Design a protein around this nucleic acid. Structure first.
Ligand SMILES: [Zn+2]
Lengths: 93, 121, 99, 107, 181, 72, 193, 73, 177, 77
RNA sequence: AUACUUACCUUAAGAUAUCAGAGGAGAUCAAGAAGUCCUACUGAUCAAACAUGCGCUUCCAAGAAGGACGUUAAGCAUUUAUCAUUGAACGUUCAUUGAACAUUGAUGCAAACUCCUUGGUCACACACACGCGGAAGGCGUG
């Protein structure tokens, strides 16, 4: 399945992220819902074109394979996904 | 940088090191890797991203280089648009300290499972 | 037939039969009869060499590699001898085989 | 039948690597990954005569002061274009592929 | 079609006559407002460009008819913002500030809370706060302006030194909510 | 594997930026697991306009992003 | 804001919007690889200027194993062409022979009689041995006097196929060396079970 | 009605034409064989640099990647 | 297959999109979630630095000053007071301009929080599902409140003051109300 | 209405045999116009009566197995 | 906590060293398969962990390293601050109409101050040659 980083992207739902795209566009806004395939949907999006302008989308849906990176907020530095030793409470049967 | 990186270590051994991962654009990300995956999606804590400008690139040609850094902090970079990663700083806490820390984490985890077994009773 | 639908452990043989009697029969010929082939690559590097192995991915070991390209700015054609090479099939555009 | 296993027989061997960018890399293989993420200690890496993206990607990797001498470089598989083996090595030994042999006995 | 549907409705025409007979009657112009926007759709870029030019020119005649309206400066600048055209929204609040000869705090705090989200370039963005600060910092109920500025300069800088400067600048000023600072 | 969450945009006028400067505005008639997109009344906007026929379908490789021009 | 107020306001309190300026890469219109690609047909001269070919020798190492496998299979088929003339097999009826295998080594032939006389009178018995070791191999051929007790000895409920002859379960067949159309032994690619 | 694999099966033994991704280069030869990944093996091919022949190639192998389309002549 | 929820410490027997959405919107998940994030921050603020403090090696040390310790009950009390006060100073915002522009013609489009058009569609969409049992909007014009001082508004609130220095105020204001 | 997914739309678009302005990936790509005679899952599309027209005297091409990835966009002209 | 109701969902596969023999699965056809599979069997190589060494090698105190998402600072130099249509005057200027961040910037060159975080500010000794416990890696042995 997923692996740690896209699990983090599944964690940072509804919080102010910033995306660069491969075009150089860095969308920024609240993260409505990410998928496992890194297609991410965003709201109140403020966009920076490659030309240097800035605009405001309301409701964007950027495809995963043109994301350059994504920045989540800082606090997720401390996240239970990163805990190397948290033991599993008897998986279901 | 005289850092003397571990001659038999790969990604999982490189954890919590300060990396200098480099991309297809030629942008550099600098920060603590805290996780990777199969596709080499990295997280990068406290990350700073540096470019060279097109103009400073002329000075880079065959020296002091005005690299442009923006600060991306906790970012989570992708395995598609990267090139290669190297290691820039060793982590904060040494091998004995990391080892004792992992011991304490495991003891606390076993204890939390004992508490789950107690609440289950 | 669909790829999951083949089976486990047929799948290797079905690839090998695809190798012997498919489009691969030029790289099949080149390794068994050791004739030199001419690989054109995406970065203008013409390569004249003899083939040691094949891949599903067309990863190709090449032995006694001639390589040759074209610096167009005028033109200096530059050549390099590289004796033992392992070439990924992504760069490989067209494999031409001389008789 | 994959040939990465070939490279897996090449730990502690000294190769060069030319990348899809145009970067040339000199330094031993410590290992290689399934999808050919090749990790390389004791690199010094060079850029032949130029590509500006490659100029940036060269300088920015530290210790540039155009040979850049680096302790340890992981290289992603889809960046490795071609890889030049040492000529001392005998290909007749390595391509035998004990897995492919066993599969011939498995048939 | 909803543009022309707005035209051919008789309510708009009667109320339009009511208003254009009487400029400085605000309460007529408020019904003019409410009819245009509430009769329009949820306002996005999908709406008809004629209707959007109508709302822009409507508030422009409003704002140049009653230049001391803080809330309708904010309403035009934000409604104009939701469409997009960020550069125009900057021009709008700056037209408002130029109408208040760059004073009176409400346009400032809302322009600036807006300007946090839009403008990215730190030296300049703090310079904009500084030009704001010498005009409306000393204002008596200006606590929200400073609280904005202090939380902000805590967010972007790494050295605390720039933040201590402003803390030592606050307490001299007789603010209303001095005591939070 | 997962089909995308364009269900909110199911009938609403969207604007793809296709590829880097192509910008196509239509109504989202369909989506598959690859983000291949069926648009109705595609009207390619150059910064001049050009209409693109009744129905169209656009490759989910070429599609970079899409905005909801209609309100939700 | 999102669903709960406290940490969405205070704790997360995300990043400043980030400073933008001019990129280095190419702004989509020119992302190209190499549209000026080579025109190979010139190089058909230079291979003549390239002018032997080195021995491959690894496909030879696999081809040795493949050729040895085909040669051992052919030696098998040569043993397949090379059971009426055989003197160990008695020219009785094939339908009245019962084959036993999986036999314990120390099993005496009188015990083999004793387990087998229950159904019919036994005509003759050949337990198969090595000719160089003279260890009992572990299988034997019985002809009774009738076919019907050979068949009742083939029908196995409570009896032979599953009987514990010298603390081991044995296996009990009709003789198929003479009877069925395509039968090859273990040496010849065949054998049963 | 027809799919790329039936058209490609029926394409075998014909003077085919192949536009690569790049428009600089096109190969006119007789199609020999094709896999499920649509790799192309051909015979006595003919180059066309932006349309004009720079030579006759022989038996030739294009990867499935670089070819923009294949046509039947 | 199994989706372990690290907060809830429960499993999802087979991952799919809908059970993920329904779980991450679930109130149990949000509660344990919020507890955890608050918890990590209060741990990191509580956790003392305890640096190595590499002590250097050194006449003019003639002056000696008295330290001031406290009782363990006094320590615990003043720490509790500081905890409560940090928690206040973080949470508190400044109202004023809401209470200042109360009567305004466009107060009820601009400060009433989802009539602003910019953040406006959020608070309708950010409204939680209201499955359990049990706005001054744009309609407001000038002629709703013609004359605000007819129907008595409350006065401007008197400004707040540190209780630590509440003893040092001007006694006996000029001009009694 | 209902959903019109791309696979079913191109099949409907294949039955109707309406003309097609099909586009390509980048600046090299030449706008092909034809009639679809069939497709696959990999969007390799055999197109009939092809006319290629350069980017802004279109020349015919016959019938074509067009490769999947190079396609940007199907339209009905 | 328990009950009830609703909504959603219920299985990708395989392997965990590798090679060669000892024995087994004592191989269902007239003495025998070939192979393949297993193993507290043995032998060889490899991987991981732990321990020990290496008279291993390198780094550890007003300054040195790193940073400033700070200033001096509008320091100095350079460049740029829309298009289309119509009218008028001698390509330019002005006016009207329609369409779509920032000059105190941006870019280059530095230089200085201030500030920040880290480190064995160890033990020994303060002298005229040609030490233990730290941190990081390499090699060897078990
Ligand atoms: Zn949960």
């Amino acid at each position: 399945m997923n692996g740690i980083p896209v699990k983090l992207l599944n964690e940072a739902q509804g919080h102010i992220v910033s995306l660069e795209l491969t075009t150089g566009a860095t969308y920024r806004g609240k993260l409505v819902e990410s998928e496992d395939s890194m297609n991410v949907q965003l709201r109140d999006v403020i966009a920076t074109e490659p030309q240097g302008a800035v605009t405001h989308m309301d409701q964007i849906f950027v495809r995963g394979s043109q994301i350059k990176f994504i920045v989540v907020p800082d606090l997720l530095k401390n996240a239970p996904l990163f805990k190397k030793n948290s033991s599993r409470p008897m998986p279901p049967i | 940088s005289k850092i003397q990186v571990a001659h038999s270590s790969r990604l999982a051994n490189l954890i919590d090191y300060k990396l200098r991962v480099l991309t297809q654009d030629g942008r550099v990300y600098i920060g603590q890797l805290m996780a990777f995956d199969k596709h080499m999606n990295l997280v990068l804590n406290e990350c700073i991203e540096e470019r060279v400008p097109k103009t400073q690139l002329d000075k880079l040609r065959p020296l002091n280089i005005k690299v442009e850094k923006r600060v991306l902090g906790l970012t989570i970079l992708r395995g598609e648009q990267i090139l290669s990663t190297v290691v820039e700083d060793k982590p904060l806490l040494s091998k004995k300290e990391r080892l004792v820390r992992d011991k304490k984490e495991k003891k606390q985890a076993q204890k939390q499972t004992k508490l789950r077994k107690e609440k289950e009773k | 037939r669909p790829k999951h639908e083949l089976s486990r452990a047929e799948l290797e043989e079905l690839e090998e039969f695809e190798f012997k009697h498919g489009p691969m029969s030029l790289i099949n010929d080149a390794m068994v009869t050791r004739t030199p082939v001419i690989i054109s690559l995406r970065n203008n590097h013409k390569i004249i060499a003899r083939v040691k192995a094949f891949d599903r991915h067309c990863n190709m070991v090449l032995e006694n590699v001639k390589e040759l390209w074209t610096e167009k700015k005028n033109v200096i054609n530059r050549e390099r001898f590289i004796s033992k090479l392992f070439l990924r099939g992504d760069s490989v555009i067209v494999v031409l085989k001389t008789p | 039948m994959k040939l990465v296993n070939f490279l897996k027989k090449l730990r502690n061997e000294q190769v060069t690597i030319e990348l899809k960018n145009g970067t040339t890399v000199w330094g031993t293989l410590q290992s290689v990954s399934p999808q050919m993420n090749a990790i390389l200690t004791d690199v010094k890496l060079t850029l032949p005569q130029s590509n500006g993206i490659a100029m940036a990607s060269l300088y920015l990797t530290g210790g540039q002061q155009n040979i850049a001498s680096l302790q340890y470089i992981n290289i992603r598989g889809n960046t490795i274009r071609q890889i030049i083996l040492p000529d001392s090595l005998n290909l007749d030994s390595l391509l035998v592929d004990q897995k492919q042999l066993n599969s011939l006995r498995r048939s | 079609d909803k543009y022309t549907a707005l035209i051919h409705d008789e309510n708009f025409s009667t109320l339009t006559l009511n208003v254009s007979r009487y400029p400085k009657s605000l309460a007529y112009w408020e019904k003019l407002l409410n009819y245009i926007v509430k009769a329009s759709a949820p306002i996005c870029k999908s709406t008809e460009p004629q209707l959007l030019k109508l709302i822009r020119c409507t508030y422009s005649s409003m704002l140049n008819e009653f230049p001391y309206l803080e809330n309708y400066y904010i309403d035009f600048a934000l409604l104009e913002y939701k469409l997009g055209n960020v550069s125009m929204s900057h021009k709008i609040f700056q037209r408002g500030l130029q109408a208040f000869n760059q004073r009176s705090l409400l346009l400032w705090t809302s322009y600036l809370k807006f300007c946090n989200n839009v403008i990215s370039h730190q030296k300049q963005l703090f310079k904009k706060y500084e030009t704001a600060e010498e005009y409306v910092g000393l204002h008596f109920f200006s606590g929200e302006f400073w609280d904005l500025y202090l939380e902000q300069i805590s967010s972007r800088c790494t050295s605390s030194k720039k933040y201590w400067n402003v803390l030592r600048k606050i307490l001299e000023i007789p603010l209303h909510s001095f005591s939070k600072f | 594997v997962s089909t995308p969450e364009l269900k909110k945009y199911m009938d609403k006028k969207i604007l793809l930026n296709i590829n880097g400067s192509r910008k196509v505005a239509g109504i989202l008639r369909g989506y598959d697991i690859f983000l291949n997109v069926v648009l109705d009344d595609a009207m390619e906007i150059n910064g001049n306009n050009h209409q693109l026929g009744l129905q169209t379908v656009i490759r989910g490789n070429s599609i970079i992003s899409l905005e909801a021009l209609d309100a939700i | 804001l999102s669903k709960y107020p406290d940490d969405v306001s205070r704790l997360f309190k995300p990043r400043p919007p980030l400073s933008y300026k001019r990129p280095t890469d190419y702004p989509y219109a020119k992302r190209q690889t190499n549209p000026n690609i080579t025109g190979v047909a010139n190089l058909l001269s230079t291979s003549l200027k390239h002018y032997x070919x080195x021995x491959x020798x690894x496909x030879x190492x696999x081809x040795x194993x493949x050729x040895x496998x085909x040669x051992x299979x052919x030696x098998x088929x040569x043993x397949x062409x090379x059971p009426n003339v055989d003197p160990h097999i008695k020219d009785t009826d094939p339908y009245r022979t019962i084959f036993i295998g999986r036999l314990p080594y120390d099993l005496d032939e009188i015990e083999l009689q004793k387990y087998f006389v229950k159904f019919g009178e036994i005509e003759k018995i050949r337990i198969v041995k090595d000719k160089i070791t003279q260890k009992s191999k572990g299988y034997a051929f019985i002809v009774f006097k009738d076919p019907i007790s050979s068949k009742m000895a083939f029908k196995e409920i409570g009896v032979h196929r599953g009987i514990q002859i010298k603390d081991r379960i044995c296996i009990v067949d009709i003789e198929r060396g003479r009877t069925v159309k395509y039968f090859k032994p273990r040496r010849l690619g065949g054998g049963l079970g | 009605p027809v799919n790329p694999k039936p058209f490609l099966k029926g394409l075998v033994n014909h003077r085919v034409g192949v536009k690569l991704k790049f428009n600089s280069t096109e190969y006119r030869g007789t199609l020999v064989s094709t896999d499920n990944y649509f790799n192309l093996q051909l015979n006595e091919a003919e180059e066309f640099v932006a349309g004009v022949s720079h030579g006759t190639l022989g038996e030739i192998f294009i990867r499935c990647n670089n070819v923009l389309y294949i046509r039947e002549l | 297959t199994r989706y372990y929820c690290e907060y809830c410490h429960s499993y999802l027997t087979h991952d799919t999109l809908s059970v993920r959405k329904s779980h991450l919107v679930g109130k149990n998940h949000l509660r344990i979630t919020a507890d955890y994030y608050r918890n990590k921050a209060r741990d990191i603020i509580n956790k003392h630095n305890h640096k190595r403090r590499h002590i250097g090696k050194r006449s003019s040390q003639n002056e000696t000053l008295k330290v001031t310790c406290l009782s363990n009950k006094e320590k615990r009390h003043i720490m509790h007071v500081k905890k409560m006060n940090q928690k206040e100073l973080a949470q508190t915002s400044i109202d004023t301009l809401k209470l200042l522009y109360d009567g305004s013609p466009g107060y009820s489009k601009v400060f009433v929080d989802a009539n602003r058009f910019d953040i406006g569609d959020l608070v309708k969409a950010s409204k939680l599902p209201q499955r359990a049992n049990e706005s001054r909007s744009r309609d407001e014009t000038c002629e709703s409140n013609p004359f605000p001082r007819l129907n008595n508004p409350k006065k401007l609130e008197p400004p707040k003051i540190l209780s630590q220095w509440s003893n040092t105020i001007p006694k006996t204001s000029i001009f009694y109300s | 209405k209902a959903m019109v997914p791309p696979i079913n739309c191109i099949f409907n678009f294949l039955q109707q045999q309406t003309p097609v302005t099909i586009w390509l990936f980048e600046q090299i790509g030449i706008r092909i116009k034809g009639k679809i005679v069939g497709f696959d899952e990999f969007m390799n599309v055999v197109i009939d009566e092809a006319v290629e027209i350069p980017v802004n005297k279109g020349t015919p091409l016959g019938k074509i197995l067009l490769k999947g990835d190079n396609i940007t966009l199907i339209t009905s002209a």
